[PDB]
Amino acid sequence: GSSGSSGIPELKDHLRIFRPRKLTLKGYRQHWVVFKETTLSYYKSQDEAPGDPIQQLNLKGCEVVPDVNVSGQKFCIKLLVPSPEGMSEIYLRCQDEQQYARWMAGCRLASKGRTMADSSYTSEVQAILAFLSLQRT
Known part of the structure; x- marks a missing residue:
């Protein structure tokens, strides 16, 4: 791929988040999410940030x-992320496979220590897109 010099590759998009085991209204609530190389943080309202995320x-x-x-x-x-108070179970639903492969692939890369910056990143998005097709009957 064609790439020279630029800032760290970060994703910016609010996915579907639902928490039935906590104070919530109108089902889903508009929030701000941000995926980092090996980190991840969100907020209740763009206002909060860049100040500080909820957790x-x-x-x-x-x-x-x-x-x-x-x-x-x-x-x-x-x-699923461990917390000093309990746990951090967040449900993220994607509209299509595109957004999924992108995010998902990113999470896995971070879990194993790797980061989106690495080429492998795309290596995951592809394998997935196809894998899904195979699942079909």
Whole structure:
């Protein structure tokens, strides 16, 4: 690929977040999410940031369980992170496979210590896009 000199590769997009085991209204709530090489933090409202996120966690180590169901072009990612108070279970649902492969692949790379900066990143997005197709009947 064509790439020279630029800032660190970071993703900016608010995915689907739902927490039935906590004070919530109107189901989902608009929030600000940001994926970092080996880090991840979100906020309640763009206002907060860049100040400080609601709860920062080091992806490197957390768990990532795939919950996608091609049956209905659905792709969710269950991120399980340990907390000194309890746990950090966040449900992220993607609209399509594109956003999924991108984010998902990023989480895995961070969990293993790796980062999106690495080329392998794309190596995951592809393998996935295809894998899904295979699953089909």
